[model samples]
Target chain A: CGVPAIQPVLSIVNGEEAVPGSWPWQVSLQDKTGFHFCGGSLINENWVVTAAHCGVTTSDVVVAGEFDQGSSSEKIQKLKIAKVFKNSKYNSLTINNDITLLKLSTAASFSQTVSAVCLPSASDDFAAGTTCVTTGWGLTRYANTPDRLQQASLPLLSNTNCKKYWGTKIKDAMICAGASGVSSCMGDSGGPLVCKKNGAWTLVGIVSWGSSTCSTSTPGVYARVTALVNWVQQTLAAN
Target chain B: RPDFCLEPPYTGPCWARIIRYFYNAKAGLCQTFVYGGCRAKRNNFKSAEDCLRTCGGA
Candidate 1:
């Protein structure tokens, strides 16, 4: 489920603009007015995972099979959201439990440009030093939003090291990962932090927050999937 | 419809060693953890019966 039909190319920002059709699970969350608010990861035919802080509504929709979000690509498939489950434990002050799931009005048909990324098991451990890619249309270091999907490779940090930078706010349910001069920025919230696990890309984290400056070496924060996988299973089962 | 069995086993960010049971999807059964009693729940239970009642027979 995590395999993209079009394997991502290396010629890319801290990353470069991704090749068309790569990162098939990448999604853009937008409102009815078509304003791209945040990025998300498709996890199933009917559900897209994102950050609770995205504060999306039922009127908001998820656009899949999209790379250049500003264009009228025939491959783009937009589906209105029918439900949203913002984590009950989500804390905006500290951004704890910063995950949410959006249910599409209709199931997205699998295609070369749209597919589900595998969810990490509850015990799946993405230890420190592992490299991962985060893709989005977020504002680059220049403070300008990208016209196409941008991908950045960053390294994960251990909780102990993360607490040194982010303090105790770096809860077990959160991840700290980034690279010098390469961090997920504004508008990248809810995007997937994908790691290639044994040849299959796994959605390891969800873009949540970062330091004040995008160019700084401070690691970015994400919603830890390993810590919250059970919640996802419970949520999906209840629905 | 509350999915207790499928909830993450949060022991809270406090100090305590109260015994607790939580269903582990990986283990496919209830497992014990040193529950640091605080603001942790949803997946937590005092007994395996409670865990099994909600998350068992998957």
Candidate 2:
């Protein structure tokens, strides 16, 4: 799950140019036929995060840490998702509960490029106006789309306003961002929304849904990772 | 060669539509550029720009 990067110089925010090389936490979903969805990081080797709506089954192959989508023969550390969990409360119409986690068959091999993103500490409070990073491989623009990993920066918003903007139609399970003229799109779903707390990179949110375009009127929506703490811990524990 | 590795979602079919419609060129190349992220960059150009330039004005 990801969003757009603000290009302060050109007034280009969320366009094709804002993606950061390292933050995307590159990923690929494949099967016997070949590649399917291209996604990004949620955590380190522990749980590979993505969109619940993206599709998952026994045949799907999830691999992380590779940048290029065309060649599969690269030196990417591959992982077969041992399990998949989708939020039961997800509302498909609103795209709420739009996130899911995949447990890999083996531990991810952490390298310079492939490592777990630190989770926001239990006590850490990431309130609105706090800046966080969102990266993904979704549509680039309303008119055209980009397949490679794209990224952007957006500040978190208060749930009050988030719900207000999204209206009661969108569930509380998701948070909101944008308003600086930047945003995320279709393919970026299931990517990571990272924030730095106490000098560590933490994935605070997961890209869920938003308006079709990146205009100032609409902001992007995301799954609150912090809100799902109990579920995450419980799921991890049971497994 | 728009470094779609750094510029994703831009090089996909959506971009090809934008490039094609905006340029009004029908007979061109439109492809799915990258298979994933973080390896080697892939290119999916929409125009016969390469061939048009290379093949000469037949």
Candidate 3:
């Protein structure tokens, strides 16, 4: 019910710059020095989902409703991180279960420029070939990080086919998408992979890791949100 | 016995806390360790009291 009506403006790989308010759930994770490194999604008012490997320290802060980092705006809500929950199963070597939850110091207020994405249920299915959109403020090109938000529209791949490209590294806890040329890049880690279901947007995955150069030779892997729905719920309840 | 070991101070380009300690869950002891500030697990704590509080020091 919180999904935005506007579509994303694209300036991604083959994508374009996302429209300012197109993706209301997008979040930028920044350090105390104000340098942004990873992207995330607001799952609810007080919690954000991101990649566990983003080097999140207690000093890190988050900004929701952010579009262009260089642009001044009234929509941005800068919040402190109260706690971090890195998946106990997270593996640094293989990037397995590479998801983390960030509890905001305070609850977020929803606006046209800010909203929360829906978390998928265990039974929810974003089957292969589903066209999902991922958004972030990562590199627009190789080794070039941008100030504005970017997005890409890519199709989901079956685990078998995805495994063919990424090899044994692709675990069941992960989802795969994109081709050789179109993919999420280095700084795009921890962003949301969202697909439409029943006319509402559902966060299906979290951007984990990809090829070294983000080439077209391989598809990007994401932490399958549905696979960890139980973990997410339990973590929220415990915290 | 002390619940935690006193780790050396961590001075760095980034924010440096006075000391770092590691809570060994199996041993129920907090050992001194270097925390460079990037990657560490839940076993790491900032104080002996914190270690005792989180990991249940013996």
- The DockQ values of the predictions, listed in order, are 0.01, 0.03, 0.03
Per-candidate clashes come to 2, 29, 12
True contacts kept of each: 0.00, 0.00, 0.00
TM-score of chain A of 2: 0.81
When only the first chain is scored, the TM-scores of the models are 0.95, 0.81, 0.94
DockQ of candidate 1, scored on C-alphas against the true complex (2 decimals): 0.01
Docking class of 1: incorrect
Residue B18, model 1: Cα distance from true site in angstroms: 42
Task: Point out the higher-scoring one by TM-score: 1 or 2.
Answer: 1
- Against the correct fold, how does model 3 do in TM-score? 0.78
Tens digit of lDDT per residue, candidate 3, span B1-58?
2433333233221111113576665676766653323334455676877877766644
Candidate 3 chain A lDDT trough over 10 residues, lowest sum: A7-16
Winner on DockQ between 1 and 3 is 3
Regions more than 4 Å wrong, model 1:
A11-13, B1-58
iRMS of candidate 3, Å: 9.8
Preferred candidate (lDDT higher): 2 or 3: 3
Q: What pairs collide in candidate 1?
A: A12-A16, A13-A16
